[PDB]
Structure formats: C-alpha cells, structure tokens
Amino acid sequence: KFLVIAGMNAIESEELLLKVGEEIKRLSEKFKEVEFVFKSSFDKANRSSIHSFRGHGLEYGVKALRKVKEEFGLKITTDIHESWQAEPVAEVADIIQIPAFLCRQTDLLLAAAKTGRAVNVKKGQFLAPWDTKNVVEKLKFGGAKEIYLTERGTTFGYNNLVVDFRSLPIMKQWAKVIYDATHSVQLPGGLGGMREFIFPLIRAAVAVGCDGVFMETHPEPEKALSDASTQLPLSQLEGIIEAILEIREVASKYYETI
Amino acid sequence: KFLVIAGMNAIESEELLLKVGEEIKRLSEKFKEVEFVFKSSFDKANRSSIHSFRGHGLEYGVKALRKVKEEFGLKITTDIHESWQAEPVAEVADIIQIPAFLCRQTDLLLAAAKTGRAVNVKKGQFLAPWDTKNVVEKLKFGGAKEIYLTERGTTFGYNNLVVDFRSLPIMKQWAKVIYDATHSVQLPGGGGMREFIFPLIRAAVAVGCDGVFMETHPEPEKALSDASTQLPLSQLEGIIEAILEIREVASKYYETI
Amino acid sequence: KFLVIAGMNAIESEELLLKVGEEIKRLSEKFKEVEFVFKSSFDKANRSSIHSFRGHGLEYGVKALRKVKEEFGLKITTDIHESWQAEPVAEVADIIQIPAFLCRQTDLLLAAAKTGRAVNVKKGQFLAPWDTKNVVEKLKFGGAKEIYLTERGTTFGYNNLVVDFRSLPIMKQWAKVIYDATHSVQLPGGGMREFIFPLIRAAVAVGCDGVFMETHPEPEKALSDASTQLPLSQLEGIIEAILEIREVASKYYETI
Amino acid sequence: KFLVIAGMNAIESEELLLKVGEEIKRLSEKFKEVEFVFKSSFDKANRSSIHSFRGHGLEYGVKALRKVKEEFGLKITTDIHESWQAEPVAEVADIIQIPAFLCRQTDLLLAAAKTGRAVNVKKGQFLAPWDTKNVVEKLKFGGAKEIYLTERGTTFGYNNLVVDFRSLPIMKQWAKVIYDATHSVQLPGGLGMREFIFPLIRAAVAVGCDGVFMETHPEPEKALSDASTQLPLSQLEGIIEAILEIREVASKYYETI
DSSP: OOEEEEEOSBOOOHHHHHHHHHHHHHHHHHOTTSEEEEEOBSOOTTOSSTTSOOOSOHHHHHHHHHHHHHHHOOEEEEEOOSGGGHHHHHTTOSEEEEOGGGTTOHHHHHHHHHTSSEEEEEOOTTOOGGGGHHHHHHHHHTTOOSEEEEEOOEEOSTTOEEOOTTHHHHHHTTSEEEEETTGGGOOTTTTOOOGGGHHHHHHHHHHHOOSEEEEEEESSGGGOSSSGGGOEEHHHHHHHHHHHHHHHHHHHTTOOOO | OEEEEEEEEEOSOHHHHHHHHHHHHHHHHHOTTEEEEEEEESOOTTOSSTTSOOOSHHHHHHHHHHHHHHHSOOEEEEEOOSGGGHHHHTTTOSEEEEOGGGTTOHHHHHHHTTTSSEEEEEOOTTOOGGGHHHHHHHHHTTTOOSEEEEEOOEEOSTTOEEOOTTHHHHHTTTSEEEEETTTSSBOTTOOBOGGGHHHHHHHHHHHOOSEEEOOEESSGGGOSSSTTTOEETTHHHHHHHHHHHHHHHHGGGOOOO | OEEEEESOSBOSOHHHHHHHHHHHHHHHHHOTTEEEEEEOBSBOTTOSSTTSOOBSHHHHHHHHHHHHHHHTOOEEEEEOSSGGGHHHHTTTOSEEEEOGGGTTOHHHHHHHHHTTOEEEEEOOTTOOGGGHHHHHHHHHHTTOOSEEEEEOOEEOSTTOEEOOTTHHHHHTTTSEEEEETTGGGBOOOOBOGGGHHHHHHHHHHHOOSEEEOOEESSGGGOSSOOTTOEEGGGHHHHHHHHHHHHHHHHTTOOOO | OOEEEEEOSBOOOHHHHHHHHHHHHHHHHHOTTSEEEEEOBSOOTTOSSTTSOOOSOHHHHHHHHHHHHHHHOOEEEEEOOSGGGHHHHHTTOSEEEEOGGGTTOHHHHHHHHHHTSEEEEEOOTTOOGGGHHHHHHHHHHHTOOSEEEEEOOEEOSTTOEEOOTTHHHHHTTTSEEEEETTGGGOOTTOOOOGGGHHHHHHHHHHHOOSEEEEEEESSGGGOSSSGGGOEETTTHHHHHHHHHHHHHHHGGGOOOO
C-alpha cells in the first residue's frame, strides 16, 4: 500500500503543527489504503543564512511530535543531524530521516540504524543513483531493516535541480523508493522554488513507479518560516492524493519487476 | 487525439520501412482515437563517426516515404538539414522535422515554415525550456501554422542526457509538446539504455504532452543507428495501449495553460 | 608561433570592420612572435530572436573581409552555416570556421575540407572533449590538412556555460587547440565580461595553440554579443599578458 | 604570502605521517616565501563504502599531528565532522577544515569559529560560488576572524566534477581562496585523473587564488584513500616551483576585487 509522508517543513509552533496534524488525520480517514506518516523537522540545521528560522530545539520538537502522535494516532518521521540525536529522536520517530547533505555521513547512518527504527535517506544532490547501493549497505550493516531512499533532485548547474526519473527504477533494486515532491522543484540559494511544478512531477513519479510520496504542507504557505515557495496549501492535499491513487491504479500494472 | 510519431530511425531498406509501415497501419486501425505519423530519416547528417550509416539519398528517401504514404495511407514526417531540402521534402511529409542540433538555425526553420506544412522542432540538448519560445516566434513569423516542440533530453554532463519534465508544461505555453521516448534515454557517444524507454514514456503522459515520438525496428540489434535505443516492433502495441490508459486518468489533472 | 584570432563578432559595417582591422594590424606589428588572424561573421545564422541583427549577406560579407585582407595584409577567417557557402567563402578565408551547433554536420565539414583551407571547429556546447576525435577524423577524410579545435564552453545547467579546462590537453591529442575567450563566458539566452581575461590566463597557463577573442570600438553599441566584446583599447595589454604567461608556463606544458 | 596546504589525505599511521612532514619541512625551508600548513584527516567520515579506511580515532590523530608540529615546527590543519570534535581538535590545528558535504551545517561552522582558530570551508559540490557569502557570514557570526573558502569542484553530471574557475574571483570578495588541486580532478563514486592535477593548478594560480591544497603520499598506489589522486611526494617540489613562477608573472594582472 502507498506511503504518503506529509507535514510542515519545520516545527514553527505547536499550534500550527497540530492544525496540520488534523488535516492528515482527516486524510488518513478518507484514504484507508494509504499509509500516512507525519513529518516535521525540529531543526533546520542547514539553512543558507544565519538569519533564517532553525527551530525550538530537540526537546521541544520531540515533545510536539509526541502530541501529534498521541492526539492523532499518526506515525512520525523527523530528521537528525548529529549522531547523538538518534536515540532521543527514536523515542517518538517511527522513521528517522537523514538529510541529503548528510547521506554519506557514516556515523549518522549507523546511529540511526542502531535505534531499531526505520530509516529514510534523502539522496544527495551530488549522488548518482547507483551510488545509493552503498548507503543501503551501511544501514543494513548497522541493523536497519526498513530502509528508504528518497528522490529529491540532482544538482543541475547553479541554483537549480533536475529530477532524473531513471533513479526510481535503479534505486528500487536496493530499497523502497520515495519521491520528495517539494524539495525537488526547489531552487537552492535562489534568493541568496516553483510550486507550479510540484503536482506534475508527482504524477510522473507514480507513472514511473515508487513506493511513496513525500510532500510538505502549510496552512499559509507564504507565511512559512521555511521552504515557503514550495510548501503546499492544506486544501490542495486531498486532490493530489486522489490523483496519485488513480494514477497508481492504472499504472501499477506496468511497473517493472524487482 | 493523441499524436504518435513512430518509425525507423533511418531508411535502411525500404523492405523494413514497409514492414514497420504496415505494423503502424494495423495499430492506427486498432487505436482510432490516435493520429499516427510515420517517422524516418532519409539521412543521418549528424553521426559522430564517418564510418556510420548515413542514408541512400534524399531521392531514395522521399521516394520510400511516398511509397509508404500510398501503400498505407499514413501521414509522413522526416527531418531536413539544410535550407534547400525544405521544398523537395514537403512533397511527401506532412510534418517537417527540424533536428535537435539545428533548432537555432534561423534559415532552416524559416524555410520549412514556408512549405505551409506543419513543423516539429527537436529541442536542442543545450536549450533551456523557456528558450523554445523564440523558436516558436521565428516560425510564426515564417508562416508556420501547426507548430510542435519535442522534448528529447538535455546535456547532463559528458555523454549523458536527462529529461527535465518541467519542460513539458513550460513549452506548452506556446506550442504543442511531443515527448521523444528514444533519443531521451540515449547516451551521446556512450549509447542508450532501452530499460528506461517505457518508464519515462509513462512519466511523459502522466505529466501531460500532446504526443510521443518513438522509434521501432523488427530486431534492434540489427539497427544501423541508435540500435541500443530502437524499440522492438512487437512491444510497440503494448506501449500504445499503456500510455492511452495512463493518459485517460492523468488528463483529469493536466494543468490548464 | 602563437595564434590570436581577433576582430568583430559580426560585420556590422565595412567602416567599423576597418577601424578594427587597423588596430589588429598595429598589434600585428608590435608582436611579430604572434600569428594574428582577423575574424568576423557576415551572418549570425543562429540568433535567438528573429528580431536580432544578422548581417548584410555573404555579399557585403566577403566584400568587407577581402578589403581588410588587402588593406592590412592580415589573414582572415569566417564561419559558414551551409555547405554551399564553402567554396565561395574559401576565396578570402584562410581558415573556414564551423559553428558550435553545427560541429557534427558532416556535409558542412566535408564541404569546408574540400576547399583545402584551414578549418577551425567550434566544439559544441553539447560535446565531450574526447568526442572531438571523430570531428578531426571527419576533416582528415575530407582532405583537411590544418585543423583546429576551439574550446568555447560546455552546457552547465540552463543558460550557463562552464569551461572544463581538461579539454585543452585532451583535444590537443589530435588537433591544435584554440580557446574562445569571449563565447566561453556567455550565458545562452547574456554575458559576464569581468571573467574574459581571467579565463584567458587560465587557458594559456594550461596550454593552448592560440586564443580566440572578439573586440569592438564601442561594445555598448555593438549589434551582436555586446556583453562579451573586449573594448579594442584593451587587446594589446591582454596580448602582452598572454605572452608573458605563455613564456613562464610553456616550460610546464605536458607532452602528447 | 602564498599558502600551500599539503599532507597526506588520511593519517594512515604516525610514521607515514612524519615521513610526509619531513618533506613538507624541507619545502618550507627551500620556499621561505610560501606559508606551508600540514594537512591530514584523522577520519574519513564520508567514505562511499562501509568497508573503506576511516582512521585511527581522534586522539590518535591529534597526537600524530602534534608530533609533526612539534618535530618540524609546521602549522597544522585537519577537518572536523561533528560539533564536539572542534574543541579537542583546536588544541593542535592552526586551521580547522570543514568538509564539503558539511559546508551548510551551521552548528559545525559555529563550533569551529568558536574555537578561535582559523577556518577553511570546502565549497560543497552543490554550491554556486555566490552562495559562499552566506557561509562566510555564519563564520563571522561565530567568531571566526581568519576565513578560507576552498574550490574543489562542482557536480557535473554523474560521477564527475568540473572546476568553474570563475569561482575564484567571485569568492575572493568574501574570503581568501584556496584551490584544492586533489579533489577537483576526482571522479566521485567512479570506482580521479592524476594527469589533470598539475594543469589545473597552473590555471588556478594564473586566474589567481591565495593558496593551493594538495594531498601527497610517498607511495600513492598504496594510499588507503583517494589513492588515484594523491601526488608522489617527489613531485611536490616541481609543482610548487612552477606555481611561484606562474604567480610571479601573472600576479600583476589579478583584478582588484
């Protein structure tokens, strides 16, 4: 059954997070066949500017993600940045996310695999798809059983990303493949993304074949303290989920095996 | 009315051209809501090696095309390489094709636009999507009425191309878009990988395009150009049905330009 | 000796074409160690907009060139966009130039090789350094004797080119190499002139058989490639620099 | 005073390190106009394979680097991978190196700046040159006073890097610039090209930069990392000589940022 990873890019506030957690609960009720997982970063450890929003800290974040899980019965995924953050995070996160810039930091991957939780690894903007076989190999060595590789775009010149859809079938050979619909259309350092392309590339993803879609959402995308240009309006989620399910239905029959 | 441009990369032997030509005809008959067009090049004026198969001349070509156009009643399309080849070829081809490397050559375009026939420009591997607008403008200024833009991959480092599927909705702003499913999986001087041909076609119809461009051959390993990318004639039907199904569902979400 | 192809990007006029031929002449006299070659195009056959300047036809073209070739005694070179322009242009052009986008068009290559002239091929923005081998194999077959490969940048994402300086030694394995100092910094569909010089020093330091650069008396008033056109009054300086760097670096140029 | 950062990629063993340091010492004596800074990693924390050499631990690596500083009187530099590593490393490092994949990791940048030591950031392969400004601003925010940016290539298609030398003058506006002659010709996940190392250094000094970074090993074929890109310890002298020579004549043309 299809995996949908949704949430706010960052934990801007517990009030905002809970509101977003409500739409996902409602959505899981409407799409019984989809496996939903609530996502949110407790820290933007890689912002370009020292002036940008980062977060309220690990403690606060883990506590807020807990509220969402306890109040909505939703599984959780959040990203970690240094080794020591795995265990504490593993307390509430069902899936530990590894940032794209860190997909090669051996200790971080090992730390995460060691918690016993599932691990999703954002493919680096510098990584060739075949080069992800070693990422999985490390996680496996570290104890990881539920492994995920997430397509999030490849460096295409300066301040731009391209999604080479060949990566989906190649990566499926070693792990469940996920398509990150929001960061893939993001233009890095662009102000120091293009929301209109989010939906069309998602359809491409499911036509090609993947095991899940990752998409960030916000009640007021233009007021988002992070990834504003690319976060989707809460009201748009429903329509996109339906199209994924419909496109997957008629397409699955053609997904290449293995 | 989805447009499907299929055929042999080049005219190797009219016998094969007819074998592929009847197969198309059969399909055009099964899929009546589809408009087929027979594609094939009378010459390969852009091969890397000097020892590579080119063609049997514009004469033998234009002749072979009309032979298929009459024996099967299928619309024809082929590409021109120099300003002159326009007029002579517009006598058998309904769609004049402009090569990828020549998409910026003002006079070649200006010419094919005069023949009154429809024009299809392969987007250069060096062109950014939003740059195809000027290509359209040149042709309109030249009398082109039915204009087509074709996605065929972009230079992604050395000996490799990538398909930026954002180009489809972008070029759709000023022309009908075609997705080249065979040259896009091709590896420049590598090459190509037939294993990705179909998956990306699926991607193209899911995103939304006005048609696809494929190339088929009775048995690829025998092809004389782009052999590792040529699609086996048999599979051609399964694919056509596949993208029609996907198109039926996907079109409900195509953005409105 | 060292090659220095200079001149205007386009033949905006025979008047201006001369003001430039005069300066190239002077520099030609001040640096007897360098083989200068006047260059300009009679037709910008590949402009982006249909509304952009092209030239005054092959007529006024070869006309203006032949004039400089006799009034200043400088060798001349220009680019052809279709096979027929080969022999007719090979009347005044010592070096026939092949545009970047056309570098794989066999007939344009064979047609230039026929004329028995020197053929300089702009390496396409879509071509790998090593793929230029066949481009030289095509010219040999076509009767070419004096061949050149020009580095003019590689497609780097949308509307941008990067100069992979590894090509210089790679290509030098089968052809003399020229570096296009003005087009290698252009932004397809735009340009940054502040990088023209720096990259030239980089080209000679690595090692090349010659430099290719376009100049104009008043760049801001140019009708083609305004942004990437050295103001005539700077060519001399740059040329002194290329020689100096070439003298110190020569010693280190690898060996094919 | 031109800066030459040199040493062996990883601290393979203390003896092998002292051997390289002996040579670096010799060079600092012969080239008194150059400022040599010895470099070596106590840990390869980003190896593609779980089976590759990483190192003998921080403590071991800090002792070795200190033995090289003490015995040969050379300045030291090494890279850090997690915040906690900054402080202990600063006891010996004159310059704290920040890995390319980690160049956007704020807490690591801050941790290094807080030590009071100079900081040299490897420009990420996904970073445009103008994006480094925000990097230099994070460091100043953290207390860094002496800052360096190192050009080490940019992602060019898969398993390949290209060096855009327009990045030197661009980055010189915010920090002193070093050119990494070793990783720039490296082919990521390819298994580099040793023959291109010297040519690119020449281009680098010609264009203009405040220093060059080059790893060296006595027996490159037996290196436990970056084997294909480490220079034979016997070639360094030639390179440095040529560099000073090129810089000598080229220096006057460096454009005043």
